[PDB]
Amino acid sequence: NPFQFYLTRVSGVKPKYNSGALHIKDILSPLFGTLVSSAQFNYCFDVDWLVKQYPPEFRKKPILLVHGDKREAKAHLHAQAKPYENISLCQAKLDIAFGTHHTKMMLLLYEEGLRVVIHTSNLIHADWHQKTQGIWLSPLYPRIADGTHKSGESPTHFKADLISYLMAYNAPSLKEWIDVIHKHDLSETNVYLIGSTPGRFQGSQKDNWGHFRLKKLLKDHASSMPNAESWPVVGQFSSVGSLGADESKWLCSEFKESMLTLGKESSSVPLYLIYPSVENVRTSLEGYPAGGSLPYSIQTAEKQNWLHSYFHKWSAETSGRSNAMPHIKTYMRPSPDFSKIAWFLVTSANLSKAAWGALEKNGTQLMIRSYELGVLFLPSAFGLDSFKVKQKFFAPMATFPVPYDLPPELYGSKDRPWIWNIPYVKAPDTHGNMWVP
Numbered sequence: 001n002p003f004q005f006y007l008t009r010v011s012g013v014k015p016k017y018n019s020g021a022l023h024i025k026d027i028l029s030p031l032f033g034t035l036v037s038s039a040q041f042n043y044c045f046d047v048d049w050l051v052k053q054y055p056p057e058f059r060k061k062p063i064l065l066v067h068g069d070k071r072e073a074k075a076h077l078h079a080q081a082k083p084y085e086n087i088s089l090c091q092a093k094l095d096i097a098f099g100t101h102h103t104k105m106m107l108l109l110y111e112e113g114l115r116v117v118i119h120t121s122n123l124i125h126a127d128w129h130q131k132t133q134g135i136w137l138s139p140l141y142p143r144i145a146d147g148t149h150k151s152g153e154s155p156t157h158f159k160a161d162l163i164s165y166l167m168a169y170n171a172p173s174l175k176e177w178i179d180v181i182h183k184h185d186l187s188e189t190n191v192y193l194i195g196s197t198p199g200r201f202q203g204s205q206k207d208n209w210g211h212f213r214l215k216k217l218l219k220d221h222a223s224s225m226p227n228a229e230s231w232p233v234v235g236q237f238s239s240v241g242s243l244g245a246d247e248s249k250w251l252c253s254e255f256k257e258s259m260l261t262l263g264k265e266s267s268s269v270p271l272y273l274i275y276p277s278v279e280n281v282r283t284s285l286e287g288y289p290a291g292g293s294l295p296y297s298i299q300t301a302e303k304q305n306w307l308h309s310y311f312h313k314w315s316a317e318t319s320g321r322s323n324a325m326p327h328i329k330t331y332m333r334p335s336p337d338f339s340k341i342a343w344f345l346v347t348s349a350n351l352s353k354a355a356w357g358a359l360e361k362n363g364t365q366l367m368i369r370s371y372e373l374g375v376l377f378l379p380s381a382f383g384l385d386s387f388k389v390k391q392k393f394f395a396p397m398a399t400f401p402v403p404y405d406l407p408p409e410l411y412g413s414k415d416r417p418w419i420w421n422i423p424y425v426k427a428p429d430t431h432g433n434m435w436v437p
């Protein structure tokens, strides 16, 4: 297949639903390359667990942990890594209030070349055990011969765009990784990078990040079709930020507007949001503890009950993962009958202004609080007008593997969105327990 989009292995489904999946031990295996060093960008780390996922022969190679922790959290992470002399840390600057470093990425430097992995899992046991998570695997990028002058650039501009993302950190340990990338040929890359970095962007920088970056790519590299207003937008996420008192404040004004862009020309488009219900979480493989990774607070939720009429249940029979709660985040544009899609995005970005950006200063400035990263699949980058949706995720190799069921199913009248900081004591979970925060 040309897409190299994978799900993580799930303990407890039948072998047929893990055949095409990847565990972290598979990604770091010597079959993927002879490791010289690596960088792990993430949010949450269990360093003891992480080192055990590298092959024994590679466990002393240098590792850089890129994180956003401060003060006592930062002290804790340093204490976790100190036992391992080969581990260095890079604290991503977070100069805007309430920002987070959410990007999940591996840079893997080999004897044989370089690989980039952009994914959705934290580096802790539970994120790779029974959740639905997404992975994009780059090709093996060869080194450019010393003395040769070539760009090593792809038609999607991936090499320059990844360097730009890393340069935004202004960090010495990542300048070294920038120099590594400069030395490699990334021309085979067929995805576009979509990142978020913290800051306030105007003018020439407005289109660099967040939902304006998505808008720009859709304007430049996708085509509008007749009856485009009938092609829905689907967003699928594991948490929700404060979006405002009604849909006109951000969700349907600037976010949806970016997401419905197609082509260069100048809304009734249906918007489906997929987010686990309480019943989804209760009957999941993990039980209520899955809700520890779906951090929608009651304080936020009670100010935006209007939003929940957009919510659709998690259902993933296509990949055997209806009971594996989602920590993947995806956004896509299906056709009215859900048989095709105009594009697909897998990312760390949840449904929040912090991640995607919010316009300020009379519409002239895009303010982002967080680091996020994802990759965008556009048919034009594969010589196509659209992607056909693969009917079974693990079953004409140009069909795109959507990991959950279409069409999405609306919440029933008795369903409620999972809200993590209130109790659920009406019915027990798959392990026999209630939820008492």
Ligand SMILES: O=C(O)c1cnc2ccccc2c1O
Pocket: 043, 102, 121, 122, 292, 293, 294, 295, 348
């Ligand atoms: O992976 C992330 O981006 C993330 C960030 N904050 C989180 C906060 C609470 C529970 C899970 C979280 C999470 O899974």
